[PDB]
Amino acid sequence: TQTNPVPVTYPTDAYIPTYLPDDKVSNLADLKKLIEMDSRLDLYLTRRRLDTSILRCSITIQLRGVDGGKVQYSPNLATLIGMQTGSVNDAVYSIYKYILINNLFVTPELGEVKLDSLLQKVLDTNAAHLPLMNVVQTVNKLVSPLPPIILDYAEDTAKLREITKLALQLNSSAQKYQFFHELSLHPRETLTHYLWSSKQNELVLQGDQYFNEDAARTSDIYSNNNNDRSLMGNISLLYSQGRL
Amino acid sequence: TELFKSKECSLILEATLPNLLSYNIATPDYHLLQKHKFPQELSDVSKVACTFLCLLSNDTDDGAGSAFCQRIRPLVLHKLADIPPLTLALSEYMENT
């Protein structure tokens, strides 16, 4: 995956209302218990999913089983490890644990090690300090592959989408409840709010009707519409700014 | 003790925090080596996790902190074999084992 979450088009777990009276519903607590039950169970599953991985001619035949599960060791590195032909990651871990046993870092101070006899023999170098990066880079060179035979002579997304859609319908029904409840308590200063805001939103929707194709190619904007006053009064300003 | 008190707060850290060391870091893979037929850096959260784990290794007198810091070493030791910048970092933890 990425380093940041993926934006997506459809909603994802919108809220549950809390202002409904519990003397009538008495059920949102139970759905709440089910939701934190799901979150706890999902926490357990995600932790376990993370922790589950935590002339005479010769015969040359390249076999079926040329396989890097058991890779051949150089005999110097075989003497340093001890095993005959084990693996590559086992080799890296064994070399690093040998270095960690012999206390060679420092008693870059932890990058530089103290080169001893066998390790200089298996690296064919003669320094005293050499960083661990190059030491484990040489492991890639010191290992050779195994020799062949030689003879000479989902539905859960849609389900969660449905639960999200249903919770949105719950939000819609709760908002339509709360409107009529607040109108039921004090009706004066919500009907005045309606008569104000409906008028203002009608003016906002009717703020765009003189910008059509054939309403601007004609002449019934510029001439005789001092009733409108909005444009053709900017021309004292727009020429003075050089736009034209 | 308050942090490592719970059976689920002290147990997520046994699985995440060794895994957060090699977060978004090109570790040397071995699937290619099983199917032929090193990073030199760190990340932004690897430094923070190494800082937190070195500070957590300073819980002396064998309370609840070093009881965690001893049970994470056999798993972090495999992470140090892959990433050599985990040798300069994780230094006070390695001195505290």
């Binding site: 003497t79 490890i81 001890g82 095993m83 066998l118 | 049970r71 056999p74």
Partner: peptide, 30 residues
């Protein structure tokens, strides 16, 4: 059981390295 596998396998690996360091003795006297 995950602990009692590792706490014996690491001692086995330490013994496998100490035996190589003792095989170092038997090739100096030859």
């Amino acid at each position: 059981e995950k602990l009692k596998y590792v706490k014996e396998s690491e001692k086995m690996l330490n013994d496998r390295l100490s035996l190589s360091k003792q095989i170092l003795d038997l090739n100096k006297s030859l």
